[PDB]
Amino acid sequence: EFEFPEELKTKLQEHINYFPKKRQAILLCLHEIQNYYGYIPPESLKPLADMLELPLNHVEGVVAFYDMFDREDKAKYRIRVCVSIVCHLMGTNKLLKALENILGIKPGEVTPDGKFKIVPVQCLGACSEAPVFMVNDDEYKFESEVQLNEILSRYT
């Protein structure tokens, strides 16, 4: 009943054809789906399971295990905020405060328009530039609220 748009199906097929075995493509596929929809639709997994030649149970288990994937909230832009030791030391809390001031939301929340979701994450591997955040694939050092406001204004 649920079916991938052809352009997305094409991209999933590229991934599945890329590695020697189809099932190796499962994470690339799930990244692609999340990119396309703004989350992982529950209904997407059975079709994905079929393309990978895997039981649905397997695909469900994988989505549950890997923290980057989100089956619950659609968001156009995921603001991943590092909450691990170095960012905490150097001012995660200031970043979160600035985010609440600008966007009106806290970690785990999505703005009402579905535009931004704040996602607390473990160390992003940019600790010298603490406190670190990502907006989808883009990554930044937080300097101040004025600076953050300008960065976020680039995402429409």
Binding site: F65, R80, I85, C123
Partner: protein, 418 residues
């Protein structure tokens, strides 16, 4: 093409090897790499026997840069005693707190890594290699995919590479949020399209790895040394730094220092020198209270004169240096480490599963001043009992740093108990 935004991590080198290009914060493409003699070590290696390459890498004293410090040549030698086919895997999962050394090679000098992968693969007779890169490094992924394409177009990958009869494809796989997928057996499970669950060892991957076949897993930084060993020879390589722990080493330094960034230094450098000589000293010239070796160890200010080597009294680990100064609350910092392990246990082993959770849950109570006497005693017990029955290193170290803070900073902990 354009890549996602990356913060420009500061990088500095006294050796001009791994950071010869990566000291500049931008992508160096194949033409720039070739200008400097790029891929010539590969050409040399293809005119050598695999056995000879293994021998040089052995005699270089190169050790694993991914945390366990296993001798690289010995690892390769073990793999090739087992019947093929064999697989080569580059571990680019780098997810330990404080640790950002591998990404600057990936993102700025991808060809240094690729050249090392091809040589390494040839040495062990692998025709299929992988890079497993964490999902939170999207720019590195796209950079690597593009660099691999560049290398193919110049004839360094594919079939019958430079007439040698050696065939190689390098596949790039992406993680999806699990620190545990840096553990080599869980990494392999993820490559096989499964959850990142570590396997009982032995067997070690070099005997039974990807699809049950001999598999060498090496860290990005480890592999980045291979070009130099072939180019210079093992003798000259061994003249870099002290003769026992030879070669360049990357040190990702963060926290309360004036110049946070990645430092390429020899391993006779002391921790004190890393902080004060290279990283510009502390913010506000405040006194050093502790150094966290990622999420593994906590060194006190009485332990700064140690060498940054793999010796028994040395810093060890991955050379990750997080600096805390006199006003930083050690218990608050310990909670952050507990939170990390809570978030990253894969849950297969009961004391790890329950222990990582309880350690963080109780420490949070302690930090907030809501802990009962039982909570205090429970915290101590759990901290000491995460390791039993553990099948991987996470369970073995989840309480290690925190226990060190308890031993080295008793007065601060006592304040929370009173």
């Amino acid at each position: 093409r354009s890549y996602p935004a990356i913060p420009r991590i500061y990088a500095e080198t006294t050796l001009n090897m791994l950071l010869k290009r990566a000291k500049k914060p931008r992508v160096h493409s194949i033409d720039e790499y070739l200008k400097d003699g790029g891929y010539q070590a590969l050409e040399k290696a293809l005119n050598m026997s695999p056995e000879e390459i293994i021998d040089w890498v052995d005699k270089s004293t190169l050790r694993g840069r991914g945390g366990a410090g296993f001798p690289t040549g010995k690892k390769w030698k073990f793999a090739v005693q087992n019947p093929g086919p064999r697989y080569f895997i580059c571990n680019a999962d780098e997810s330990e707190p404080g640790t950002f050394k591998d990404r600057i090679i990936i993102e700025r000098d991808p060809h240094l890594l690729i050249e090392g992968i091809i040589i390494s693969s040839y040495a062990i007779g692998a025709n299929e290699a992988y890079i497993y890169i964490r999902g939170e490094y999207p720019a590195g992924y796209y950079i690597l995919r593009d660099a691999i394409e560049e290398a193919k177009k110049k004839g360094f990958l594919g079939k019958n590479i430079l007439g040698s009869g050696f065939d190689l494809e390098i596949y790039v796989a992406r993680g999806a949020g699990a620190y545990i997928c840096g553990e080599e057996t869980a990494l392999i499970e993820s490559l096989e399209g499964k959850r990142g669950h570590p396997r009982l060892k032995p067997p070690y991957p070099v005997q039974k790895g990807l699809w049950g076949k001999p598999t060498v897993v090496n860290n990005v930084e480890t592999i980045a040394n291979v070009r130099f060993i072939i180019s210079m020879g093992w003798e000259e390589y061994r003249y870099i730094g002290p003769s026992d722990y030879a070669g360049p080493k990357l040190f990702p330094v963060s926290g309360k220092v004036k110049k946070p960034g990645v430092y390429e230094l020899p391993m006779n450098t002391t921790l004190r020198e890393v902080i004060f000589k290279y990283a510009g000293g502390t913010l506000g010239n405040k006194k050093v209270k502790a150094v966290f070796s990622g999420a593994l160890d906590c060194f006190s200010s009485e332990e700064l004169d140690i060498p940054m080597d793999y010796s028994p009294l040395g810093f060890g680990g991955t050379g990750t240096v997080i600096v805390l100064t006199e006003e930083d609350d050690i218990v608050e910092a310990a909670l952050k480490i507990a939170e990390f392990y809570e978030h990253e246990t894969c849950g297969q082993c009961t004391p790890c599963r329950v222990g990582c959770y309880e350690q963080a849950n109780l420490l949070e109570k302690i930090y907030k001043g809501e802990a009962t006497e039982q909570d205090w005693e429970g915290f101590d017990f759990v901290n000491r009992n995460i390791q039993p029955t553990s099948i991987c290193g996470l369970g073995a170290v989840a309480g290690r740093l925190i226990r060190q803070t308890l031993e080295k900073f008793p007065e601060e902990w006592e304040k929370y108990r009173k």
